[PDB]
Write a protein that binds this ligand. Sequence first.
Ligand code: HEM
Ligand SMILES: NCCc1c[nH]cn1
Length: 184
Amino acid sequence: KCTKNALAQTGFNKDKYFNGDVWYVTDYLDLEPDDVPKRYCAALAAGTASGKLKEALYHYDPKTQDTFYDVSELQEESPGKYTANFKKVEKNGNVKVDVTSGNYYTFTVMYADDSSALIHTCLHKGNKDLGDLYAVLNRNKDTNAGDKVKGAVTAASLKFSDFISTKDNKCEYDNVSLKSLLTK
Ligand code: HEM
Ligand SMILES: NCCc1c[nH]cn1
């Protein structure tokens, strides 16, 4: 089950956030981790296309090399708070799983600047919650969390010590497809 009391950034700048660029998940805190251990890689590209906010998502498992993509049309609930109805797609946009009613995620930009961000996500799949997930994002995949996003982690009453770094997971990203999926 997820918390809805996540606080959106005061004076959050949509323009720089939703610029069509890629954000890398450099650290994360899964509050409801799966039973089986999984090395994780994820990146996303939030922008706009044909009049809408769009977000394209990428997950990768270094170990199995399994990869999946999702692209969603975003609905602003409030500045900094968005609901996303996703569809799983091939890297060229061919739909593998259509948009469906109990399938969607919500996120709250808790902190953001030109280079970094702290988001909270709540994944809902099949009318069921997959639990809270907080992620530290960076425009550069090799950059360590700075003092500002860390103060933001503390400010949300979390411990950065409890966050898992993806820096050593031998991650690989497909930025080209991420960006082109933005219009699919
Ligand atoms: C950066 C923000 C992220 C967002 C918005 C996000 C969103 C999602 C979405 C939409 C799905 C559904 C895929 C589909 O079925 O079409 C998914 C699945 C999955 N994600 Fe993420 N994710 C993020 C970060 C990550 C990270 C860092 C991890 C590692 C904890 C993670 C692990 C997984 C796993 C294990 C699945 C399969 C779900 C299941 O267990 O059924 N994701 N994610
Ligand atoms: N507890 C895992 C939920 C999740 C995975 N990806 C995004 N959210």
